[PDB]
Design a protein around this ligand. Structure first.
Ligand SMILES: [Zn+2]
Lengths: 148, 257
């Protein structure tokens, strides 16, 4: 319930120093719980810090790679709230790099689109360019038409 | 006081890769040696492949890197990785924060590692825009706040230069050639400031020389040269250099147009 604020107060910590004690499946798993309960709490600071504490290289493991879709999806939701964009586009980029969603044509279209829309909304700047001009050359973007 | 010396082959490979990646930014690594606290010397460069994302930490490719390392070992090029080039085409030379974090990832390898930003497009047949510097137009990003600038120079062997000479054969074209103008701005300035400097020396020689004999004067001044001869002398170079300088342009304008 909304009382998950009161409860989740405790688990804004309990993951903290259990780092090496937990196994990353469960461990990271309820780090993600901390995330979504933090957004449903409506407070992004602990979503933010509780988020960045994970270390991305764990995504060498295909197992954890299946999970991280959640991770990025949230990072999107956050960043949308922050009204950042270029950052969003970097995430959607990253998920879009997943073999699992590289494959399926019905997967990567609605993410690829969003990558466009946000690279459009981001303000003109350094990384905007080379990100765009890279998308511009991605063969898959040919399959889309208006967005193209 | 701190500086880097960038060998020619480094600079040319640099500008080549940069100009080739336009309009997307390219990155690579810098091979060299740290002479002292006050110097970094860069003799070599190799180019780092593109990434789906922009130039960033993981853009550095370990496999690629060492794979290049050993294959240079067999050529005797063994050097440290002293810095990393980069390009911000059209945006001038500065580090984005994302440039910064990576620069840190090169701090913890070596504390003196430097960042080199190249800017392909607006670097042009005139001055080449290049920059090298390390952390703590550009002031918007905190040129001095998060990081700080460095200086750059170019090592040239004798033979190197000698190859470069034969690129342009100026033997026919000489006489319509106009040498660099800014340089004759420091010329036509420093010359004048100098003439000022020795003016009052000629003044002191005419007053002192007035009230003191030639035999006494010689004893004093024979060490240095007759400041009247720095007037007579120095006036010239300004004269004729400025007359050929004028005439040359007067001809290039009417003849070439
Ligand atoms: Zn950059």
């Amino acid at each position: 319930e909304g009382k998950i604020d009161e409860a989740a107060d405790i688990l804004c910590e309990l993951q903290v120093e259990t780092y090496g004690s937990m196994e990353m499946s469960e461990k990271i798993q309820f780090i993600l719980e901390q995330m979504e309960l933090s957004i449903l709490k409506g407070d992004y600071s602990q979503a933010t810090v509780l988020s960045r504490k994970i270390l991305k290289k764990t995504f060498k493991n295909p197992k954890y790679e299946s999970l991280k879709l959640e991770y990025y999806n949230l990072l999107v939701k956050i960043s949308l709230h922050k009204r950042e964009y270029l950052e969003v586009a970097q995430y959607l980029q990253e998920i879009y790099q997943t073999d699992a969603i590289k494959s399926d044509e019905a997967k990567w279209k609605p993410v690829l689109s969003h990558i466009v829309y946000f690279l459009v909304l981001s303000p003109y700047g350094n990384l905007q360019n080379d990100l765009i001009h890279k998308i511009q050359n991605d063969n898959n973007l040919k399959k889309l038409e208006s967005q193209e | 006081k701190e500086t880097v010396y960038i060998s020619s082959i480094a600079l040319l490979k640099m500008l080549k890769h940069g100009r080739a990646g336009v309009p997307m930014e390219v990155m690579g690594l810098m091979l060299g040696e740290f002479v002292d606290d006050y110097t970094v010397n860069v003799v070599d460069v190799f180019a780092m492949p593109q990434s789906g994302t922009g130039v960033s930490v993981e853009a550095v490719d370990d496999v690629f890197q060492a794979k290049m390392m050993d294959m240079l070992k067999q050529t005797g090029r063994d050097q440290m990785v002293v810095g990393w080039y980069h390009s911000h085409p059209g945006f001038g030379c500065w580090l984005s924060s994302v440039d910064v974090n990576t620069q840190k990832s090169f701090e913890q390898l070596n504390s003196r590692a430097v960042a080199v930003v190249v800017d392909p497009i607006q670097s042009v047949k005139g001055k080449v825009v290049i920059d090298a510097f390390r952390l703590i137009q550009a002031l918007i990003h905190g040129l001095n706040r998060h990081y700080y600038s460095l200086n750059i120079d170019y090592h040239k062997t004798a033979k190197e230069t000698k190859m470069l000479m034969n690129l342009h054969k100026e033997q026919w074209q000489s006489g319509l050639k106009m040498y660099d103008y800014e340089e004759k701005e420091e010329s036509n300035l420093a010359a004048t400031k100098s003439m000022v400097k020795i003016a009052e020396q000629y003044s002191k020689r005419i007053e002192e020389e007035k009230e003191l004999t030639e035999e006494e004067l010689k004893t004093r001044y024979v060490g240095r040269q007759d400041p009247k001869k720095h007037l007579s002398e120095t006036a010239d170079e300004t004269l004729e250099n400025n007359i050929v300088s004028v005439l040359t342009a007067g001809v290039n304008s009417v003849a070439i147009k």
